[PDB]
Amino acid sequence: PEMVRGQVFDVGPRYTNLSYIGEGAGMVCSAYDNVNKVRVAIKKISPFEHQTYCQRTLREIKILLRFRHENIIGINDIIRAPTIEQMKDVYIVQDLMETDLYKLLKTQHLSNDHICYFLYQILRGLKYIHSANVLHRDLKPSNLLLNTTCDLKICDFGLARVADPDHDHTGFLTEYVATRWYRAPEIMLNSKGYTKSIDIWSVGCILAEMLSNRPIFPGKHYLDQLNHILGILGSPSQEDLNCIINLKARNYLLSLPHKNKVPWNRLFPNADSKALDLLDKMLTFNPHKRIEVEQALAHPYLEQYYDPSDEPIAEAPFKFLPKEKLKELIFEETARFQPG
């Protein structure tokens, strides 16, 4: 059994020369693949004690194995014990990606051509995810992986769900799991984050962050996230308020001092005007009025890239429980990788 930091990282004999990386979810390391002759990334997952983490591990593995797209991280291999009883960890092998958009934005100015290109690839991947009736629900720069030629792949489907717009309504101040700064305004008001518009918001936030290297709405707590949003978009219109039937959420918005829109061209003076037109459409307060992924692809900003015949959709969309049974399902889901 190979060791890294005095812990089992048991992956051989296909994957040799381990270098440590981090502590993502369990721990992460790189390694040399001996069948394909490329180095790879390997995540150790240990979820069998908790039914919640079984559900998340199973959801991510099921989704990633269903999906096949250039702009979504694939699972190359899964390593685990030959029996349920001996299975204590799972190792997920993926393409080694030299960096991510979070890291890149910490030290690199992005040219307008890079921003355009990254945005295109994000939306191309998202078109596919949405076409499978899946919501990612945690899009943010650290979940966008990049290699040295700037190919981009969406990762981390741990919070992803099958779309469920008929059951999206909730009361005011409902607790939310996904990363605060990329949460759409409606999450804090009346939304469980079960519609596609939740992801387009996050993409809008990422576009803004790409332009300035700084998060656009860095809220310090749950309702501060909404005050950051309204300080730029301005107070919602009566029409957009009329769409919020929940009284607590409506009265909260009514209680706030009036705030006027900050023009995008003042926040981002060096930005391409077409980039700002698209940004405005993704960062729209009203989720029903917010641009759809396909409309965003078709926007003049992306005209150099847009090619719907080369923007594939999912062949097999996702149409629609104790940890003991989920361990069996994870074991089952990962069976295809066993020597055979």
90: annotated binding-site residue? no
> Is 27 labelled as part of a ligand binding site?
yes
Nominal resolution (angstroms)? 1.6
Tokens matching residue 333: 């889901």
Which method was used? Answer: X-ray
The neighbour count for residue 190, using CB atoms within 10 Å, is: 21
Q: Which sequence positions are flagged as catalytic?
A: 138
Q: Is 24 annotated as a binding residue?
A: yes
Q: Is 153 annotated as a binding residue?
A: no
Residue 109 C-alpha from the chain's centroid: 22
Q: Distance between CA atoms of 306 and 284, rounded to whole angstroms?
A: 22
Find out whether 188 is annotated in a ligand binding site. no
The response to whether 6 counts as a known ligand-binding position is no
Chain position carrying tokens 């332009």 = 211
22 is annotated as contributing to ligand binding = yes
Instruction: Tell me the CATH architecture of domain 99-310.
Output: Orthogonal Bundle (1.10)
Count Cβ neighbours within 10 Å for each residue of 262-301 and write b for 16 or more, e otherwise: eebeeebeebbeebbebbebbbbbbbeebbebbebbebeb
* Non-local CB neighbours of 130 within 8 Å, separated by 6+ positions: 163, 196, 199, 293
**Nearest CA-CA partner of 45 in 89, 97, 109:** 89
- The residues near 306 (Cβ < 8 Å, ≥ 6 apart) are 120, 297, 298
Which phi and psi angles does 28 have, rounded to 5°?
Answer: -125, 145
Q: Is 77 in contact with 181 (CB distance < 8 Å)?
A: no
Separation CA 340–CA 336 (nearest Å): 8
Please measure the distance between the N-terminal and C-terminal CA atoms of the chain and give it in whole angstroms: 22
Cα 107 to Cα 109: distance, rounded to the nearest angstrom: 7
82 exposure class (CB count in 10 Å sphere: 0-12, 13-18, 19+): exposed
Closest Cα partner for 11 from 324, 335, 337, 330?
Answer: 337
Contact residues for 228 (Cβ-Cβ < 8 A; gap 6+): 216, 217, 218, 219
Residue 324 CA to residue 48 CA, distance in Å, equals 8
For residues 141-155, one letter each, b for 16 or more C-beta atoms within 10 angstroms of the residue's C-beta and e for the rest, the string is: bebbbbeeeeebbbb
